[PDB]
Structure formats: structure tokens, C-alpha cells
Amino acid sequence: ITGLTGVMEFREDSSNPYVQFEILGTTYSETFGKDMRKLATWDSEKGLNG
Amino acid sequence: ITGLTGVMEFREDSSNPYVQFEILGTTYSETFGKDMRKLATWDSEKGLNG
């Protein structure tokens, strides 16, 4: 199925291997400040993306 | 009357002079970048406000 969160399924060992995040890394320095930035994203299909 | 724009009344020369501006001039610095600044608001009834 596909619904309000993403992918939920079941496997033949009673497991759901799906998860997929996103990495919002705000850069801050001593003099520069809070640089609002998404550095990467992470999926269960490719590992790290970014 | 009172409404959206506020004060409505007319003079002998038939004038409704009411307004509430805001003049917002940010003193710039090249080391900070983006900013959300709100300075003082201007009224018709005090003339200059700050």
C-alpha cells in the first residue's frame, strides 16, 4: 500500500525494512550565523544522498 | 465611522487625511545577509513618529 507516511509492508521474517529520511543541516559559524540549509537526504534504496 | 482603513471624517474643504504608514529603512551591513526587521510605524496624528 501507500498512504500517509510512505511505504509499510511485511516480509517473510515479520519485518518492514522501509525508512526514508532527509537531513536538514543548518550551518552556523562564530561570525557567519545560521545558514538555513538542507545538506542531504537518506533513503533505504541508495543509502546517503547528498 | 470606523472600518478597514480606520478613521473616516471630512473637513470644511472636504478632506479625509487619515493614514498610518511605516517607513522602514534597514541600516545595512555586508556581513549579515538576510534579515527580518520592523522599525517604527508612522502615523498621521503625531506627524513624525520617532
Side-chain angles (χ1 to χ4, degrees):
Chain A
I1 61 169
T2 302
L4 294 171
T5 310
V7 176
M8 188 273 284
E9 67 178 359
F10 299 101
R11 298 294 181 92
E12 293 177 352
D13 54 352
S14 298
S15 65
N16 191 7
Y18 182 75
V19 65
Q20 186 170 1
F21 285 165
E22 59 185 1
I23 301 168
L24 304 173
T26 298
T27 301
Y28 170 78
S29 178
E30 296 177 355
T31 59
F32 182 73
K34 304 293 291 295
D35 178 76
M36 293 299 294
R37 187 175 298 276
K38 176 176 182 294
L39 287 174
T41 184
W42 187 84
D43 55 351
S44 64
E45 293 86 3
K46 298 184 291 295
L48 180 59
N49 191 1
Chain B
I1 62 99
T2 59
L4 297 169
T5 59
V7 172
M8 178 178 287
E9 193 175 2
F10 301 97
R11 298 292 185 270
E12 293 86 3
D13 54 355
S14 297
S15 66
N16 190 8
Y18 177 71
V19 73
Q20 183 181 3
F21 280 100
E22 55 184 1
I23 293 92
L24 308 181
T26 296
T27 62
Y28 196 80
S29 179
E30 293 186 352
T31 62
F32 190 76
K34 300 297 292 187
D35 185 73
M36 302 298 173
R37 184 185 293 271
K38 186 254 180 65
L39 297 175
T41 65
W42 188 74
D43 55 350
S44 62
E45 64 182 1
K46 289 191 289 183
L48 182 68
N49 193 359

